[PDB]
Amino acid sequence: SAKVAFSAIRSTNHEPSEMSNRTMIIYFDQVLVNIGNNFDSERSTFIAPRKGIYSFNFHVVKVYNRQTIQVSLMLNGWPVISAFAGDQDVTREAASNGVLIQMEKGDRAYLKLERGNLMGGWKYSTFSGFLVFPL
Amino acid sequence: SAKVAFSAIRSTNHEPSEMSNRTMIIYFDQVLVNIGNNFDSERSTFIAPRKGIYSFNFHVVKVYNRQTIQVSLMLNGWPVISAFAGDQDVTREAASNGVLIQMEKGDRAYLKLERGNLMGGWKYSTFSGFLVFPL
Amino acid sequence: SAKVAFSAIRSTNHEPSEMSNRTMIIYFDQVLVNIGNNFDSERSTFIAPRKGIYSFNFHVVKVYNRQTIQVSLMLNGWPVISAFAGDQDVTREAASNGVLIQMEKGDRAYLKLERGNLMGGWKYSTFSGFLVFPL
Amino acid sequence: SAKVAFSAIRSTNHEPSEMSNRTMIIYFDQVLVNIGNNFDSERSTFIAPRKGIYSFNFHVVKVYNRQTIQVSLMLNGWPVISAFAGDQDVTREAASNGVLIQMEKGDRAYLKLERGNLMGGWKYSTFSGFLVFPL
Amino acid sequence: SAKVAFSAIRSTNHEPSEMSNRTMIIYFDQVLVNIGNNFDSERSTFIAPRKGIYSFNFHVVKVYNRQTIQVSLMLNGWPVISAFAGDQDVTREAASNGVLIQMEKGDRAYLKLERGNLMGGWKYSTFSGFLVFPL
Amino acid sequence: SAKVAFSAIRSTNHEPSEMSNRTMIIYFDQVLVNIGNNFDSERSTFIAPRKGIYSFNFHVVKVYNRQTIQVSLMLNGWPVISAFAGDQDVTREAASNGVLIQMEKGDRAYLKLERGNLMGGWKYSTFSGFLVFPL
Numbered sequence: 044s045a046k047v048a049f050s051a052i053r054s055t056n057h058e059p060s061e062m063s064n065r066t067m068i069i070y071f072d073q074v075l076v077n078i079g080n081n082f083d084s085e086r087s088t089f090i091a092p093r094k095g096i097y098s099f100n101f102h103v104v105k106v107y108n109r110q111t112i113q114v115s116l117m118l119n120g121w122p123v124i125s126a127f128a129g130d131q132d133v134t135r136e137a138a139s140n141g142v143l144i145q146m147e148k149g150d151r152a153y154l155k156l157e158r159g160n161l162m163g164g165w166k167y168s169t170f171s172g173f174l175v176f177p178l
Numbered sequence: 179s180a181k182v183a184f185s186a187i188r189s190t191n192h193e194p195s196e197m198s199n200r201t202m203i204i205y206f207d208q209v210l211v212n213i214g215n216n217f218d219s220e221r222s223t224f225i226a227p228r229k230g231i232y233s234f235n236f237h238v239v240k241v242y243n244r245q246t247i248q249v250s251l252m253l254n255g256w257p258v259i260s261a262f263a264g265d266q267d268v269t270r271e272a273a274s275n276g277v278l279i280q281m282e283k284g285d286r287a288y289l290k291l292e293r294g295n296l297m298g299g300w301k302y303s304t305f306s307g308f309l310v311f312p313l
Numbered sequence: 314s315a316k317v318a319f320s321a322i323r324s325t326n327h328e329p330s331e332m333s334n335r336t337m338i339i340y341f342d343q344v345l346v347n348i349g350n351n352f353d354s355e356r357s358t359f360i361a362p363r364k365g366i367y368s369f370n371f372h373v374v375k376v377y378n379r380q381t382i383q384v385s386l387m388l389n390g391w392p393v394i395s396a397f398a399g400d401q402d403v404t405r406e407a408a409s410n411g412v413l414i415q416m417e418k419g420d421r422a423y424l425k426l427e428r429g430n431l432m433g434g435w436k437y438s439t440f441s442g443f444l445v446f447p448l
Numbered sequence: 449s450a451k452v453a454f455s456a457i458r459s460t461n462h463e464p465s466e467m468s469n470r471t472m473i474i475y476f477d478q479v480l481v482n483i484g485n486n487f488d489s490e491r492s493t494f495i496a497p498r499k500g501i502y503s504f505n506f507h508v509v510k511v512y513n514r515q516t517i518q519v520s521l522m523l524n525g526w527p528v529i530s531a532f533a534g535d536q537d538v539t540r541e542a543a544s545n546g547v548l549i550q551m552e553k554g555d556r557a558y559l560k561l562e563r564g565n566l567m568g569g570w571k572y573s574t575f576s577g578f579l580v581f582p583l
Numbered sequence: 584s585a586k587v588a589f590s591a592i593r594s595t596n597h598e599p600s601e602m603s604n605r606t607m608i609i610y611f612d613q614v615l616v617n618i619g620n621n622f623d624s625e626r627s628t629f630i631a632p633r634k635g636i637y638s639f640n641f642h643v644v645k646v647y648n649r650q651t652i653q654v655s656l657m658l659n660g661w662p663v664i665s666a667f668a669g670d671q672d673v674t675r676e677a678a679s680n681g682v683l684i685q686m687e688k689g690d691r692a693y694l695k696l697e698r699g700n701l702m703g704g705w706k707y708s709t710f711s712g713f714l715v716f717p718l
Numbered sequence: 719s720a721k722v723a724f725s726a727i728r729s730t731n732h733e734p735s736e737m738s739n740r741t742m743i744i745y746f747d748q749v750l751v752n753i754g755n756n757f758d759s760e761r762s763t764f765i766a767p768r769k770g771i772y773s774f775n776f777h778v779v780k781v782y783n784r785q786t787i788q789v790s791l792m793l794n795g796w797p798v799i800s801a802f803a804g805d806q807d808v809t810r811e812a813a814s815n816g817v818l819i820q821m822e823k824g825d826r827a828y829l830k831l832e833r834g835n836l837m838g839g840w841k842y843s844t845f846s847g848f849l850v851f852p853l
Contacts, residue, residue, distance in 0.1 A: 048311070049278070052277070075277065096316075125354075127407070134263065141441070144346060145345070169277055175443050181446045183413050183446070185412050185413035189562065190563045191518060191562065211414060215464075237411070274409060302410075306413045308366070391526065428730055428839070449702040451715075457664055457682070475835050480683065481684055516809045528750065534809020536671075536808060538651060538670050539676075542808075546775050572810055574682055576683045586851045587816045590819060593815070653817060674804020676804035691797070707799070
């Protein structure tokens with residue numbers, strides 16, 4: 044099975060859970076796609092089923108909360124790429140980035156909030172990825 | 179044929195047509211890619227040729243027009259994801275987002291302007307997508 | 314071999330080289346992925362190994378430097394898509410865009426800074442791409 | 449035959465055809481010169497009969513129509529050079545530019561309206577070119 | 584002798600002569616080029632020495648004089664192409680156009696002011712042409 | 719070799735270099751044509767390879783910058799022809815002119831900004847020329 048893909052979104056204004064405050068992980072409640080069921084909705088983490096090249100993209104949308112944020116794509120607890128978002132009232136803005144990375148089986152991919160907070164929710168945020176090809 | 183991909187751009191400053199004002203659909207005049215010819219340039223809509231997981235990305239670039247906008251990726255008249263863009267003069271900014279979604283044959287994908295307008299044109303805007311794998 | 318993919322990042326605050334000032338090319342020092350070794354790290358250019366549809370994405374992250382920038386994806390010295398980024402101190406912002414394009418063998422893909430400069434470095438910038446399918 | 453040259457003008461106030469609105473191509477009804485008959489009056493396109501260096505010049509004259517325009521010289525669907533024209537009532541003004549380019553046989557040259565419209569006609573507009581020398 | 588070319592400019596602020604008012608011909612006092620001596624400086628007219636395709640270009644620069652002008656390239660007393668120039672104080676503007684035309688021996692080419700006047704002079708105006716190839 | 723031709727354009731919004739401020743020379747970064755390699759891109763100067771009649775054309779496109787400009791075609795540090803452009807916001811306008819001149823070997827041709835500045839860039843500007851015939 045060379046078919047692996049997942050897609051998740053934040054569909055609500057809901058505030059960060061007390062757990063979110065501790066782990067600093069960005070959680071996505073609604074899963075649009077999860078072929079291979081390799082994405083754990085509960086922990087919002089992608090566990091690679093096999094060795095290959097994976098694509099990842101994320102858009103974290105925040106609102107005016109007196110904070111500037113930094114979102115990082117994590118690989119086994121280590122940051123790979125980062126995105127930023129300023130603070131202003133006129134509109135929502137998104138911390139967006141994406142990358143291709145090689146992963147081995149059991150490698151964990153997820154989003155962590157390196158700075159600031161997501162008070163006011165992070166509705167419309169998106170996190171998706173898929174296996175480009177195995178190795 | 180598991181090869182399906184399209185890519186379109188807004189190559190001009192030209193203003194929204196009277197039709198654009200009615201349908202609120204964002205139109206792309208120039209098509210860089212359209213394998214399978216599943217992208218209708220006239221209506222700027224992607225019709226899925228088969229059941230599978232599709233990837234979508236869009237960047238809608240606007241200019242200072244006294245308006246803040248919201249672009250949404252539509253699936254059969256229903257919003258899937260959204261992007262936003264504030265209003266200021268110093269630079270152009272883009273409403274960008276992307277997602278993986280499952281589609282069946284005859285499902286329609288396109289961009290709709292949920293709020294604000296694109297007076298001053300939306301040149302440099304991009305909309306692309308491809309079949310990741312069928313199902 | 315239908316497996317082709319590359320991924321590069323700017324991992325440092327380091328200033329533009331004197332060469333960067335001349336060629337206006339955006340350079341990425343660290344390569345996360347380079348299957349097929351079709352990405353030349355030295356010139357930060359992707360040379361297509363065969364005819365097919367390729368995907369490209371880039372995020373150029375700049376800091377407050379009194380300048381507004383424009384990054385363009387180049388194809389054989391011709392711009393395909395562009396991205397912009399304003400100037401303010403509260404946060405970093407990114408010039409981001411992406412597209413699917415058809416390339417033939419020996420076609421060159423790379424990023425050029427059409428306007429402004431990247432004084433203060435362009436750390437956290439990303440540039441990636443892969444062969445979706447050959448033709 | 450190293451003798452190749454064409455010259456065309458817009459001799460009337462007539463409005464853009466419904467076709468013009470779709471293709472965004474600027475059409476010239478009257479042909480003053482067409483040695484080698486390499487200029488297609490119907491599509492207002494120059495098809496190079498051989499490899500060489502060609503000269504091109506164009507003046508697109510518009511009237512007060514509430515629009516600002518941008519005319520581009522196209523080479524196989526790609527812009528080479530561009531010209532602009534503001535909007536005011538006191539006089540007609542022209543979007544003018546010219547260039548020398550290398551073309552191979554079967555290369556297509558024509559003018560496209562990148563932005564705005566030519567309501568009120570584009571009378572007195574001119575488009576001409578010739579083979580400087582072959583290669 | 585297939586070498587034929589001329590180039591003339593208006594090098595002074597000087598007003599239109601009483602003769603200019605009658606004939607409506609635009610005169611150029613200084614001749615930069617006149618190979619074949621086929622350009623008559625006195626009457627500012629090009630007399631074709633042989634049958635061939637000739638290129639012509641002109642830029643008539645006027646100043647704020649309460650008038651809008653129209654310059655036409657004349658061929659044996661008949662207009663071929665025209666150019667226009669509005670009226671405003673902030674800058675000089677030019678009535679510019681150019682064309683390739685077939686001429687026979689003894690055919691006369693010159694510029695005529697179809698409307699308005701050139702009070703305030705037409706300094707920096709240019710008129711040039713050359714034999715592209717004979718027939 | 720009677721084949722000599724060059725063509726250059728300003729392809730970016732980029733501001734005048736500190737060097738531009740000193741020398742007042744208008745620089746063109748992108749070269750479309752340079753047969754005989756007689757055009758020096760670095761100094762944006764054409765050095766005649768032989769004695770003959772050369773054609774020159776230029777369009778310098780500026781934006782609203784609170785300044786009115788004057789561009790002159792220079793021959794060995796001496797002005798030959800000039801063009802002007804007013805200041806207004808509704809559109810870009812171009813300082814355009816052209817001429818045929820006799821040059822000897824080692825004669826230098828280039829564009830100089832006689833007045834005003836090109837803040838806001840001079841994108842879409844064009845400068846081209848070719849040997850009509852030798853002498």
